[PDB]
Amino acid sequence: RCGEQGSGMECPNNLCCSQYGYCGMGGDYCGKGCQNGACWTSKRCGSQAGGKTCPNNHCCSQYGHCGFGAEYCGAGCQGGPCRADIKCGSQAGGKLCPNNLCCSQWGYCGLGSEFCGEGCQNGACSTDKPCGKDAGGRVCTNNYCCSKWGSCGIGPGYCGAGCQSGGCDG
Protein backbone atom coordinates (compact mmCIF):
# COMPACT_ATOMS: atom_id res chain seq x y z
CA ARG A 1 0.00 0.00 0.00
CA CYS A 2 0.94 3.65 -0.54
CA GLY A 3 -0.04 7.06 0.85
CA GLU A 4 -2.37 7.27 3.87
CA GLN A 5 -2.97 3.50 3.90
CA GLY A 6 0.78 2.83 4.11
CA SER A 7 2.55 5.42 6.28
CA GLY A 8 2.89 7.82 3.33
CA MET A 9 4.64 5.24 1.09
CA GLU A 10 5.22 6.47 -2.48
CA CYS A 11 5.05 4.58 -5.76
CA PRO A 12 8.09 3.91 -7.97
CA ASN A 13 8.67 5.88 -11.19
CA ASN A 14 5.99 8.54 -10.55
CA LEU A 15 3.18 5.97 -10.56
CA CYS A 16 0.11 7.36 -8.85
CA CYS A 17 -1.20 6.34 -5.43
CA SER A 18 -4.97 5.96 -5.74
CA GLN A 19 -7.46 6.95 -3.03
CA TYR A 20 -7.33 3.29 -1.88
CA GLY A 21 -3.53 3.28 -1.53
CA TYR A 22 -2.58 1.24 -4.59
CA CYS A 23 0.07 2.04 -7.22
CA GLY A 24 -0.89 2.46 -10.86
CA MET A 25 -1.44 4.72 -13.86
CA GLY A 26 -4.52 6.28 -15.45
CA GLY A 27 -7.68 7.91 -14.08
CA ASP A 28 -8.35 5.41 -11.29
CA TYR A 29 -4.94 6.22 -9.74
CA CYS A 30 -3.85 9.62 -11.07
CA GLY A 31 -7.36 11.12 -11.25
CA LYS A 32 -9.73 12.03 -8.40
CA GLY A 33 -8.45 10.81 -5.01
CA CYS A 34 -4.79 10.65 -6.09
CA GLN A 35 -2.60 10.87 -2.98
CA ASN A 36 0.90 11.11 -4.53
CA GLY A 37 2.95 10.44 -7.69
CA ALA A 38 2.03 11.97 -11.05
CA CYS A 39 -1.41 13.17 -9.89
CA TRP A 40 -3.45 14.83 -12.66
CA THR A 41 -4.31 17.63 -10.22
CA SER A 42 -0.89 18.71 -8.92
CA LYS A 43 -0.42 19.02 -5.16
CA ARG A 44 0.03 22.45 -3.58
CA CYS A 45 3.32 23.37 -1.88
CA GLY A 46 5.51 26.18 -0.53
CA SER A 47 4.33 29.59 0.67
CA GLN A 48 0.91 29.07 -0.96
CA ALA A 49 0.46 25.84 1.02
CA GLY A 50 1.78 26.80 4.46
CA GLY A 51 5.30 25.62 3.62
CA LYS A 52 4.15 22.08 2.76
CA THR A 53 6.67 20.06 0.74
CA CYS A 54 6.03 18.09 -2.48
CA PRO A 55 5.96 14.27 -2.37
CA ASN A 56 8.07 12.11 -4.75
CA ASN A 57 10.90 14.69 -4.70
CA HIS A 58 8.90 16.84 -7.13
CA CYS A 59 9.88 20.52 -7.48
CA CYS A 60 7.75 23.27 -5.93
CA SER A 61 7.13 26.01 -8.50
CA GLN A 62 7.00 29.74 -7.69
CA TYR A 63 3.19 29.33 -7.80
CA GLY A 64 3.10 26.55 -5.22
CA HIS A 65 2.37 23.60 -7.51
CA CYS A 66 4.35 20.33 -7.64
CA GLY A 67 5.97 19.07 -10.84
CA PHE A 68 9.05 18.67 -13.02
CA GLY A 69 10.65 20.63 -15.87
CA ALA A 70 11.83 24.26 -16.08
CA GLU A 71 8.48 25.74 -14.93
CA TYR A 72 8.76 23.88 -11.59
CA CYS A 73 12.50 23.40 -10.95
CA GLY A 74 13.76 26.58 -12.65
CA ALA A 75 13.45 30.23 -11.58
CA GLY A 76 11.43 30.79 -8.39
CA CYS A 77 11.54 27.10 -7.42
CA GLN A 78 10.56 26.86 -3.73
CA GLY A 79 11.48 23.26 -2.92
CA GLY A 80 12.47 19.83 -4.23
CA PRO A 81 15.41 19.42 -6.65
CA CYS A 82 15.54 23.07 -7.78
CA ARG A 83 18.01 23.85 -10.57
CA ALA A 84 19.64 26.51 -8.37
CA ASP A 85 22.23 25.52 -5.77
CA ILE A 86 20.69 25.36 -2.28
CA LYS A 87 22.66 26.76 0.65
CA CYS A 88 22.69 25.26 4.16
CA GLY A 89 24.78 24.73 7.29
CA SER A 90 26.87 27.07 9.42
CA GLN A 91 27.62 29.17 6.32
CA ALA A 92 23.90 30.00 6.19
CA GLY A 93 23.06 30.47 9.89
CA GLY A 94 22.63 26.75 10.58
CA LYS A 95 19.90 26.35 7.93
CA LEU A 96 18.81 22.73 7.38
CA CYS A 97 18.30 21.04 4.03
CA PRO A 98 14.68 20.12 3.25
CA ASN A 99 13.56 16.47 2.85
CA ASN A 100 16.58 15.12 4.77
CA LEU A 101 19.07 16.10 2.05
CA CYS A 102 22.65 16.22 3.33
CA CYS A 103 24.36 19.55 3.96
CA SER A 104 27.94 19.25 2.69
CA GLN A 105 31.12 20.64 4.27
CA TRP A 106 30.77 23.50 1.75
CA GLY A 107 27.22 24.37 2.79
CA TYR A 108 25.26 22.98 -0.16
CA CYS A 109 22.28 20.59 -0.10
CA GLY A 110 22.35 17.26 -1.93
CA LEU A 111 22.70 13.49 -1.71
CA GLY A 112 25.68 11.27 -2.43
CA SER A 113 29.13 10.85 -0.86
CA GLU A 114 30.27 14.42 -1.69
CA PHE A 115 27.34 15.70 0.38
CA CYS A 116 26.66 12.99 2.96
CA GLY A 117 30.26 11.89 3.54
CA GLU A 118 33.16 13.59 5.31
CA GLY A 119 32.15 17.04 6.60
CA CYS A 120 28.40 16.49 6.30
CA GLN A 121 26.69 19.03 8.62
CA ASN A 122 23.09 17.74 8.71
CA GLY A 123 20.51 15.50 7.03
CA ALA A 124 21.13 11.86 6.05
CA CYS A 125 24.90 12.00 6.79
CA SER A 126 26.79 8.72 6.43
CA THR A 127 29.42 9.79 8.98
CA ASP A 128 27.28 8.30 11.79
CA LYS A 129 28.78 10.31 14.68
CA PRO A 130 27.81 9.05 18.16
CA CYS A 131 25.20 10.86 20.24
CA GLY A 132 23.78 10.73 23.77
CA LYS A 133 25.23 10.13 27.22
CA ASP A 134 28.39 8.43 25.91
CA ALA A 135 29.05 11.30 23.48
CA GLY A 136 29.05 14.28 25.85
CA GLY A 137 25.28 14.39 25.38
CA ARG A 138 25.48 15.46 21.73
CA VAL A 139 21.97 15.72 20.28
CA CYS A 140 21.36 14.72 16.67
CA THR A 141 20.65 17.25 13.93
CA ASN A 142 17.20 17.41 12.23
CA ASN A 143 15.65 16.32 15.54
CA TYR A 144 16.65 12.74 14.65
CA CYS A 145 16.34 10.36 17.60
CA CYS A 146 19.40 9.29 19.53
CA SER A 147 19.10 5.56 20.26
CA LYS A 148 20.07 3.74 23.47
CA TRP A 149 23.17 2.67 21.53
CA GLY A 150 24.21 6.27 20.88
CA SER A 151 23.50 6.51 17.15
CA CYS A 152 21.28 8.96 15.28
CA GLY A 153 18.30 7.99 13.12
CA ILE A 154 14.56 7.39 12.74
CA GLY A 155 12.72 4.15 13.50
CA PRO A 156 11.51 2.07 16.48
CA GLY A 157 15.09 1.21 17.44
CA TYR A 158 16.00 4.91 17.60
CA CYS A 159 12.85 6.71 18.74
CA GLY A 160 11.29 3.97 20.87
CA ALA A 161 12.57 2.42 24.09
CA GLY A 162 15.87 3.92 25.25
CA CYS A 163 15.58 7.00 23.01
CA GLN A 164 17.92 9.57 24.55
CA SER A 165 16.97 12.74 22.66
CA GLY A 166 15.18 14.00 19.55
CA GLY A 167 11.80 13.01 18.14
CA CYS A 168 11.47 10.30 20.79
CA ASP A 169 8.06 8.64 20.97
CA GLY A 170 5.66 9.87 23.67
Next chain:
Amino acid sequence: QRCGEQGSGMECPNNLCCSQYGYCGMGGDYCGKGCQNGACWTSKRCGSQAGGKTCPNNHCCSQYGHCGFGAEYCGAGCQGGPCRADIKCGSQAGGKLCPNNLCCSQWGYCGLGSEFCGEGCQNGACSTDKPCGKDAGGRVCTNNYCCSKWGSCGIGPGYCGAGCQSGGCDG
Protein backbone atom coordinates in the same frame (compact mmCIF):
# COMPACT_ATOMS: atom_id res chain seq x y z
CA GLN B 1 3.07 -1.50 4.91
CA ARG B 2 6.56 -2.41 3.67
CA CYS B 3 8.95 -0.66 1.25
CA GLY B 4 11.42 -2.05 -1.30
CA GLU B 5 11.26 -5.72 -2.29
CA GLN B 6 8.96 -6.47 0.67
CA GLY B 7 6.48 -3.85 -0.56
CA SER B 8 6.24 -3.99 -4.38
CA GLY B 9 9.20 -1.63 -4.89
CA MET B 10 7.55 0.92 -2.62
CA GLU B 11 9.54 4.02 -1.66
CA CYS B 12 9.77 6.02 1.58
CA PRO B 13 8.67 9.65 1.88
CA ASN B 14 11.23 12.47 2.18
CA ASN B 15 14.26 10.37 1.14
CA LEU B 16 13.90 8.13 4.19
CA CYS B 17 15.86 4.91 3.70
CA CYS B 18 14.23 1.56 3.06
CA SER B 19 16.12 -0.97 5.20
CA GLN B 20 17.17 -4.46 4.10
CA TYR B 21 14.01 -5.58 5.96
CA GLY B 22 11.63 -3.29 4.05
CA TYR B 23 10.89 -0.59 6.61
CA CYS B 24 11.35 3.19 6.46
CA GLY B 25 13.82 5.08 8.63
CA MET B 26 17.06 6.98 9.00
CA GLY B 27 20.50 5.97 10.27
CA GLY B 28 22.71 2.92 9.81
CA ASP B 29 20.00 0.29 10.28
CA TYR B 30 18.17 1.76 7.29
CA CYS B 31 20.63 3.75 5.15
CA GLY B 32 23.63 1.49 5.79
CA LYS B 33 24.26 -2.06 4.64
CA GLY B 34 21.23 -3.51 2.84
CA CYS B 35 19.51 -0.16 2.14
CA GLN B 36 17.08 -0.65 -0.80
CA ASN B 37 16.20 2.94 -1.74
CA GLY B 38 16.08 6.49 -0.35
CA ALA B 39 19.21 8.21 0.94
CA CYS B 40 21.34 5.04 1.06
CA TRP B 41 24.87 5.70 2.32
CA THR B 42 26.12 3.67 -0.65
CA SER B 43 24.39 5.39 -3.58
CA LYS B 44 22.66 3.12 -6.09
CA ARG B 45 24.17 2.80 -9.55
CA CYS B 46 22.34 4.04 -12.65
CA GLY B 47 22.61 5.07 -16.31
CA SER B 48 25.05 3.68 -18.88
CA GLN B 49 27.31 2.45 -16.02
CA ALA B 50 24.49 0.16 -14.81
CA GLY B 51 22.61 -1.07 -17.91
CA GLY B 52 20.36 2.02 -18.14
CA LYS B 53 18.82 1.47 -14.69
CA THR B 54 17.02 4.55 -13.36
CA CYS B 55 17.43 5.99 -9.86
CA PRO B 56 14.62 5.31 -7.37
CA ASN B 57 13.05 8.24 -5.41
CA ASN B 58 13.47 10.49 -8.47
CA HIS B 59 17.14 11.06 -7.65
CA CYS B 60 19.49 12.38 -10.35
CA CYS B 61 21.78 10.00 -12.25
CA SER B 62 25.18 11.70 -12.41
CA GLN B 63 27.52 11.51 -15.40
CA TYR B 64 29.40 8.78 -13.52
CA GLY B 65 26.26 6.70 -12.94
CA HIS B 66 25.63 7.28 -9.22
CA CYS B 67 22.29 8.38 -7.71
CA GLY B 68 22.00 11.61 -5.72
CA PHE B 69 21.17 15.34 -5.68
CA GLY B 70 23.05 18.62 -6.14
CA ALA B 71 25.00 20.13 -9.05
CA GLU B 72 27.33 17.09 -9.19
CA TYR B 73 24.36 14.78 -9.85
CA CYS B 74 21.69 16.89 -11.60
CA GLY B 75 24.07 19.24 -13.48
CA ALA B 76 26.49 18.56 -16.34
CA GLY B 77 26.31 15.01 -17.69
CA CYS B 78 23.19 14.07 -15.73
CA GLN B 79 21.79 10.85 -17.28
CA GLY B 80 18.40 10.64 -15.55
CA GLY B 81 15.97 11.96 -12.95
CA PRO B 82 15.37 15.69 -12.47
CA CYS B 83 18.40 16.83 -14.53
CA ARG B 84 18.94 20.60 -14.67
CA ALA B 85 19.01 20.56 -18.50
CA ASP B 86 15.70 20.53 -20.41
CA ILE B 87 14.81 17.06 -21.72
CA LYS B 88 13.47 16.73 -25.27
CA CYS B 89 10.85 14.19 -26.34
CA GLY B 90 7.97 13.40 -28.69
CA SER B 91 7.57 14.38 -32.33
CA GLN B 92 10.03 17.26 -31.89
CA ALA B 93 12.74 14.70 -30.98
CA GLY B 94 12.02 11.62 -33.14
CA GLY B 95 9.16 10.29 -31.01
CA LYS B 96 11.41 9.78 -27.98
CA LEU B 97 9.57 8.83 -24.77
CA CYS B 98 10.17 10.43 -21.40
CA PRO B 99 11.62 8.26 -18.61
CA ASN B 100 9.84 7.47 -15.29
CA ASN B 101 6.33 8.08 -16.79
CA LEU B 102 7.06 11.81 -17.17
CA CYS B 103 4.74 13.62 -19.58
CA CYS B 104 5.95 14.81 -22.97
CA SER B 105 4.45 18.28 -23.48
CA GLN B 106 2.98 19.77 -26.65
CA TRP B 107 6.39 21.47 -27.10
CA GLY B 108 8.35 18.21 -26.74
CA TYR B 109 9.84 18.48 -23.24
CA CYS B 110 9.63 16.07 -20.30
CA GLY B 111 8.07 17.18 -17.03
CA LEU B 112 5.12 16.94 -14.68
CA GLY B 113 2.21 19.30 -14.17
CA SER B 114 -0.61 20.62 -16.34
CA GLU B 115 1.81 22.32 -18.78
CA PHE B 116 3.35 18.94 -19.55
CA CYS B 117 0.54 16.44 -18.87
CA GLY B 118 -2.35 18.54 -20.19
CA GLU B 119 -3.53 19.50 -23.66
CA GLY B 120 -1.19 18.29 -26.40
CA CYS B 121 0.60 15.82 -24.10
CA GLN B 122 2.34 13.23 -26.34
CA ASN B 123 3.23 10.42 -23.89
CA GLY B 124 3.76 9.55 -20.21
CA ALA B 125 1.22 10.33 -17.48
CA CYS B 126 -1.00 12.59 -19.66
CA SER B 127 -4.18 13.83 -17.91
CA THR B 128 -5.94 14.19 -21.28
CA ASP B 129 -7.03 10.53 -20.94
CA LYS B 130 -7.63 9.96 -24.67
CA PRO B 131 -9.63 6.81 -25.52
CA CYS B 132 -8.21 3.49 -26.75
CA GLY B 133 -9.29 0.10 -28.13
CA LYS B 134 -12.40 -1.10 -30.01
CA ASP B 135 -14.30 2.19 -29.66
CA ALA B 136 -11.30 4.36 -30.49
CA GLY B 137 -10.79 2.74 -33.90
CA GLY B 138 -8.38 0.18 -32.42
CA ARG B 139 -5.93 2.85 -31.26
CA VAL B 140 -3.25 1.85 -28.76
CA CYS B 141 -1.86 3.62 -25.69
CA THR B 142 1.58 5.23 -25.51
CA ASN B 143 4.29 3.84 -23.17
CA ASN B 144 2.83 0.33 -23.71
CA TYR B 145 0.15 1.24 -21.15
CA CYS B 146 -2.75 -1.20 -20.86
CA CYS B 147 -6.03 -0.36 -22.58
CA SER B 148 -8.87 -1.49 -20.32
CA LYS B 149 -12.05 -3.22 -21.54
CA TRP B 150 -13.63 0.20 -20.89
CA GLY B 151 -11.35 1.94 -23.41
CA SER B 152 -9.02 3.91 -21.11
CA CYS B 153 -5.20 3.77 -20.77
CA GLY B 154 -3.38 2.90 -17.54
CA ILE B 155 -1.56 0.41 -15.32
CA GLY B 156 -3.27 -1.82 -12.75
CA PRO B 157 -5.52 -4.90 -12.62
CA GLY B 158 -8.47 -2.85 -13.94
CA TYR B 159 -6.50 -1.96 -17.08
CA CYS B 160 -4.15 -4.92 -17.62
CA GLY B 161 -6.34 -7.70 -16.17
CA ALA B 162 -9.41 -9.27 -17.77
CA GLY B 163 -10.71 -7.45 -20.85
CA CYS B 164 -7.37 -5.76 -21.59
CA GLN B 165 -7.38 -4.84 -25.28
CA SER B 166 -3.71 -3.82 -25.81
CA GLY B 167 -0.47 -2.73 -24.12
CA GLY B 168 1.34 -4.73 -21.44
CA CYS B 169 -1.73 -6.83 -20.59
CA ASP B 170 -1.50 -9.68 -18.08
CA GLY B 171 -1.18 -13.30 -19.20
